[PDB]
């Protein structure tokens, strides 16, 4: 235990979920690599340390403890070597930029319009539930082959998997403090199995253009498919973050723009600025805030800390994206910040595989929103609360417009 960091013993899991930025501002200054007792792990808080660990030859991926309890093996985020190479080859075809550009407009734009048509003349909406989450899940769900799974159900599953995979608190002995918090993750997985097993049965015999059919068949000898137990953990990884994060990025970008009314006006007037607005939104409130980790494979010294082999380090990219070595007043959303590197998609061989797709989902969603409701305003009678340490985003976004 590091003596000058004794204050970390009193940091709680609830504090980090409600708002992790004050604790992490101290970590960035005091200890860029620091052991946080309630998380049971070293955490990397600065841009230099996160990028170093994520790209180091002396580290490889490891799943967080609660992530492992939630996803099992081989989750694409938690494995390395030949298995990781295979799972990357499995997921990459539909995410290739030239491929996304073929069909992303015809996928997302009619989905955004469908959800907008439900409320665009109301004069009020809660955009997280009514727009950002539905467009995110319906887009990806259709790409995957889950057309028949309602957006309400996809939203419920990612919320249960989020809480399970971020159920990280440990007690004085390093044991999970809230073991009952994994039960709703187990229940989501059981429901997913009941829906998806018959789809896999069908795709094995009758392949189609759905992404999960391609995960079963691509790259395989004739008449063979990847075993469903081998792909289900990556299906679960998708049904948490890939379903959740484009909605979170959309919504955080909107909260940021509302916080800078002159910048919201600029972006509504000039939608070619939407990609810049989104990149700043991701830096400003990173959707994947501290959900992944790496483990040393040899003894290594990082940020002055001598780590043995086998040491996990959580990558708190959402903190690294407020590093004041890189950014001026990072807690302020600013469209006009210079377009600098950021870590909201991670780094290294385990960096996000879906960046290009995700950026287009968020872009098309915001384009359609501002076209439909150009006089959109935040409802300032309602607070926006952000929640989450592992995955972070606004829990609601009440808006109003003159009808
Ligand atoms: C704005 C939305 C998104 C954000 C901010 C985001 C961010 C991230 C981050 C931070 C990681 C971990 C990287 C690391 O540990 O260094 C990651 C991993 C990953 N993401 Fe994205 N993600 C988003 C959307 C998506 C979508 C929509 C997909 C799929 C269609 C996707 C697929 C993946 C995959 C497959 C991985 C695992 C990569 C690996 O471990 O090799 N992401 N993402
Ligand atoms: C793409 O989904 C994830 C990325 C990182 C950690 C958990 C996820 O579900």
Numbering used by the authors: 5 to 407
Sentences from the paper on this structure:
GcoA belongs to the CYP255A family of cytochrome P450 enzymes. However, GcoAB shows poor reactivity toward syringol, which can be derived from sinapyl alcohol via high-temperature reactions and represents the aromatic functionality of S-lignin that must undergo O-demethylation for further catabolism via ring-opening dioxygenases.
Thus, we prepared the GcoA-F169A variant and measured its guaiacol and syringol binding properties. Both ligands were able to stimulate the Fe(III) spin state conversion at levels close to wild-type (WT), with KD values in the low micromolar range. Each protein variant also crystallized successfully with guaiacol and the structures showed that the orientation of the bound ligand remained consistent with that of the WT enzyme. Even the largest reduction in side chain bulk, represented by the GcoA-F169A variant, retained the ideal reactive geometry for the natural substrate. Moreover, GcoA-F169A has a slightly improved performance with guaiacol as a substrate relative to the WT enzyme. Unexpectedly, we found that GcoA-F169A not only binds both guaiacol and syringol in a productive orientation analogous to guaiacol in WT GcoA, but also is more catalytically efficient for O-demethylation of both guaiacol and syringol relative to WT, where O-demethylation is well coupled to NADH oxidation.
